[PDB]
Design a protein around this ligand. Sequence first.
Ligand SMILES: [Zn+2]
Ligand SMILES: [Zn+2]
Ligand SMILES: [Zn+2]
Length: 70
Amino acid sequence: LCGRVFKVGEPTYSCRDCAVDPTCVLCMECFLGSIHRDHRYRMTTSGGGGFCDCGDTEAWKEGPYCQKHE
Ligand SMILES: [Zn+2]
Ligand SMILES: [Zn+2]
Ligand SMILES: [Zn+2]
């Protein structure tokens, strides 16, 4: 699993099509290797803290894993 903890200023990505709720997010590496880069995504700059949800089926209605972690 990715598990990346976001640092100050780091971009986080959600998918408006696949996220189960708005707290479901991916780090940049997982987002760019995921199906969601072709979807309606939303980038929010992190203030630090929280973690990447790559791999969590309860976080994503489709495409829970990126190509690196699948
Ligand atoms: Zn990640
Ligand atoms: Zn990943
Ligand atoms: Zn998506």
